[PDB]
Amino acid sequence: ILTFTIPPSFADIFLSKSANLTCLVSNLATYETLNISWASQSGEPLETKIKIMESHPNGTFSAKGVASVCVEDWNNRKEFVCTVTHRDLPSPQKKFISKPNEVHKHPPAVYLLPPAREQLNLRESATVTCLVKGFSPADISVQWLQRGQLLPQEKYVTSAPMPEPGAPGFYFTHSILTVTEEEWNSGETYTCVVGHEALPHLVTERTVDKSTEGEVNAEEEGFENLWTTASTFIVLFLLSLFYSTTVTLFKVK
Amino acid sequence: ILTFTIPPSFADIFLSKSANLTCLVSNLATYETLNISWASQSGEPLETKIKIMESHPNGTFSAKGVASVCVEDWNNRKEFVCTVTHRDLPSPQKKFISKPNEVHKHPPAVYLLPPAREQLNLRESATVTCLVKGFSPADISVQWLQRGQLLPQEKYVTSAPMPEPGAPGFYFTHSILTVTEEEWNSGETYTCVVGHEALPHLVTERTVDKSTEGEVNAEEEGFENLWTTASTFIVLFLLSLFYSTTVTLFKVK
Amino acid sequence: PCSQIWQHPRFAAKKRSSMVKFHCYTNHSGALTWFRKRGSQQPQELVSEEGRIVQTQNGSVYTLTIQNIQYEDNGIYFCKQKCDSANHNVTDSCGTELLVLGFSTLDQLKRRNTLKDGIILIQTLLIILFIIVPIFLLLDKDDGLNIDQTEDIVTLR
Amino acid sequence: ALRVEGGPPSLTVNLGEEARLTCENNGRNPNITWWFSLQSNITWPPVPLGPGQGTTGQLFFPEVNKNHRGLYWCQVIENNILKRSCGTYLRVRNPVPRPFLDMGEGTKNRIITAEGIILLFCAVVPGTLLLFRKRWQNEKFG
Ligand SMILES: *[C@@H]1O[C@H](CO)[C@@H](O)[C@H](O)[C@H]1NC(C)=O
Ligand SMILES: *[C@@H]1O[C@H](CO)[C@@H](O)[C@H](O)[C@H]1NC(C)=O
Ligand SMILES: *[C@@H]1O[C@H](CO)[C@@H](O)[C@H](O)[C@H]1NC(C)=O
Ligand SMILES: *[C@@H]1O[C@H](CO)[C@@H](O)[C@H](O)[C@H]1NC(C)=O
Ligand SMILES: *[C@@H]1O[C@H](CO)[C@@H](O)[C@H](O)[C@H]1NC(C)=O
């Protein structure tokens, strides 16, 4: 029998503003004596949700204990105890879950890559990818929006964070938004939002579309004055050349 | 006593021009009375080679059955069965096997993607990403080349194969070659190759290298060429003015 | 009474002739007037044009869409409403400050600016030269040498 | 029963430079809050910031970063009365740091046209001087 304690994910933590502890028990021959009770180090009673997963092919069972606690307790590295008294276990098992120790923090650097021209040449489909690189906590949720409307997770995939090469402790991940060529052809604006703990605001957003030259510069160039100078200079070249030729001919006579 | 059937691999078929059907049986208490032979669905016996490895530390022996038959019959999905009998087996362990389910078998479609200009704006590092998508087999080996030399795994990282949305049973992968900022200035050759079973030439490679691959867009550069010709014309006008000035000075002097 | 108007992405950095969808979500029902503001000038009424300003009413929501957007469309966009509640309590929206972006690849701008700096330095040099040419030429034409007969600092002067 | 000035609909600031927000209201000294959000409908509730400083309720970012783009709307509570503002939008642009060449596109292109006109005229006049000189020296030789 192997028992583990699993902290809740970042997505649910931000969604419900209430962390859910886990008391994962495995390899249970019997479940009639199963009892998962959750408590803190001070002994404060707490409600425990008990749910049983499907039986494993080998015949072993599993169960998890869910307890609703505020996220601030997790931020204060508060300790919690799950008490399990099972007939297969010779003695009751006491364990503690808390926030891990201090570790270097780095907010993610989001980067949204547009599809390559070669990919568009097959006129089949487009896969918009936004690279999220350089975050120390692996708990990162990346979503995508279409015209500000949420996109189901069946239309895109997000690779699990993998350690950053050349820099230990940092993690990077990708997210591919496969979009039909008809939808991308209409000048759609596609964005990926990155919810992550180390972010100063806990959430950011990056955009890209057909423009691909979406540099922010307000209005600096492109005015009609450029055309005015071009035309007046064409005239200037003509007059200068004519003047030089007339000067040469007046030197002649 | 567990009997396992190992389908032949394509490597020796490509090299030795023959396929080996392996009937690997482990957890064998004794072998002096073992009788293992290859057979067919229609009862046709096959030539079986018996090869026995050394004793397993758990106290159980093992045996194998090796046969050589033409690849074309195996490509025709003929059901070959390996007969395994032993003194400790109340019933023979006849495992029925054929070609595993062949699928659409489409070759990868590599679309090298350039780094994001926002990332280059930091003047620190750039990631070159080559999306490899649209292949049926799980196995795939992406390697990057630098000036014709293979890039070791110590510098780049690649994502494990994952199913692609919109087409069940269709796989894809990815990759990322971190490069330093002065590496991206130098215009080195960044290319990633892909090894795959379904590739008609067995190897494919895309080329997005140096420091810029180009991008055609909409209007956008028209005033740019207008500015370039305006600068050229200012240059010509300056040259004509200097020529006239020098002629005037020389005639005066 | 009539101050429950909603709006959408306000900054809306866009390239010339691009597409975004406006609306006028509200919790009321009455007369509506689209208004456009540029800079610090006074509010002005918008005029509908097909394929340039699309106006579809989704019940209580007044959808809007502006195609062929140019630099003259830079400014603030919002939808007014009329609240004839026996007090002339006239309320308005908040705003949508549209911006038009210059596409200088954020990099060619440096090259152009360096080039114009070169040309106006060439102005300084050439204008000094062509102001010293006429006097020094009419001195010889009318008929420097006298000053030499009358040292390096004086010549520079 | 109360209103609040919406403030600028958008805002711009250089990277690494301080950005200060604003919340103007008619109240005497009424409860104020900062509720950061994003552009459109996301899956996360608005992120409340700190309480601000001063009577106005002004934010302060001593060293803003690229991640700080988004709406910043201020929340005001005045004796159990709630009212929502409109929301600003922080953003960085990294403007051009080169002011030597007479900042202002129109300025530089106009002085370029003036360059052409004045250079052509001040080159033409020497031609008249040269022809006058040639005539006068030819008269002198005779
Ligand atoms: C309009 O106001 C009522 C009353 O507060 C509310 O129930 C309703 O949801 C509002 N509708 C919208 C579109 O906000
Ligand atoms: C309002 O908008 C929805 C969503 O685009 C659309 O389905 C609906 O038909 C619109 N109202 C109309 C056209 O009556
Ligand atoms: C609008 O309503 C507010 C709140 O009742 C009031 O103070 C203000 O004077 C009104 N404005 C007009 C024009 O009636
Ligand atoms: C609202 O007013 C109460 C009055 O005591 C104060 O404690 C509270 O901090 C105020 N809200 C803020 C500033 O978040
Ligand atoms: C906004 O997002 C939420 C969460 O995805 C969704 O439930 C809601 O329907 C969306 N917009 C509308 C129309 O309320």
From Swiss-Prot, chains A, B:
Superkingdom: Eukaryota
Important for oligomerization, as annotated region: 102-212
Residue positions the entry lists as glycosylated: N20, N35, N58
Disulfide-bonded cysteines: C23-C82, C130-C192
Chain positions covered by the region annotation CH4: 102-212
Region (CH3): 1-101
Protein known as: Mu' chain
Organism: Mus musculus
Span within the parent record: 223 to 434 of 454
From Swiss-Prot, chain C:
Disulfide bonds: C2-C83, C24-C79
The keyword RNA-binding is annotated on this UniProt entry: no
Keywords noted in UniProt: Adaptive immunity, Cell membrane, Disulfide bond, Glycoprotein, Immunity, Immunoglobulin domain, Membrane, Phosphoprotein, Receptor, Signal, Transmembrane, Transmembrane helix
Ranges in the topological domain labelled Extracellular: 1-117
Main location: membrane
Function: Required in cooperation with CD79A for initiation of the signal transduction cascade activated by the B-cell antigen receptor complex (BCR) which leads to internalization of the complex, trafficking to late endosomes and antigen presentation. Enhances phosphorylation of CD79A, possibly by recruiting kinases which phosphorylate CD79A or by recruiting proteins which bind to CD79A and protect it from dephosphorylation.
Protein name: B-cell antigen receptor complex-associated protein beta chain
UniProt organism field: Mus musculus
Record gene name: Cd79b
Full-sequence range covered: 42 to 213 of 228
Curated annotation (Swiss-Prot), chain D:
Residues passing through the membrane, by range: 111-132
Membrane topology: Single-pass type I membrane protein
Keyword Transferase included in the entry's annotation: no
Cysteine disulfide partners in this protein: C23-C74
GO MF: identical protein binding; transmembrane signaling receptor activity
Keyword flag Cytoplasm: no
GO CC annotation, single: plasma membrane
GO BP annotation list: adaptive immune response; B cell activation; B cell differentiation; B cell proliferation; B cell receptor signaling pathway
Domain Ig-like C2-type, first and last residues per copy: 2-90
Residues carrying sugar: N31, N41
Tissue-specific expression: B-cells.
PTM text: Phosphorylated on tyrosine, serine and threonine residues upon B-cell activation. Phosphorylation of tyrosine residues by Src-family kinases, including LYN, is an early and essential feature of the BCR signaling cascade. The phosphorylated tyrosines serve as docking sites for SH2-domain containing kinases, leading to their activation which in turn leads to phosphorylation of downstream targets. Phosphorylation of serine and threonine residues may prevent subsequent tyrosine phosphorylation.
Keyword entries, A-Z: Adaptive immunity, Cell membrane, Disulfide bond, Glycoprotein, Immunity, Immunoglobulin domain, Membrane, Methylation, Phosphoprotein, Receptor, Signal, Transmembrane, Transmembrane helix
Extracellular side: 2-110
Subcellular location per the Swiss-Prot or TrEMBL entry: Cell membrane
SUBUNIT field: Heterodimer of alpha and beta chains; disulfide-linked. Part of the B-cell antigen receptor complex where the alpha/beta chain heterodimer is non-covalently associated with an antigen-specific membrane-bound surface immunoglobulin of two heavy chains and two light chains. Interacts through its phosphorylated ITAM domain with the SH2 domains of SYK which stimulates SYK autophosphorylation and activation.
Comment text on domains: The transmembrane helices of CD79A and CD79B chains and two IgM heavy chains assembly in a four-helix bundle structure that appears to be conserved among different BCR isotypes.
Protein name according to UniProt: B-cell antigen receptor complex-associated protein alpha chain
Native source species: Mus musculus (Mouse)
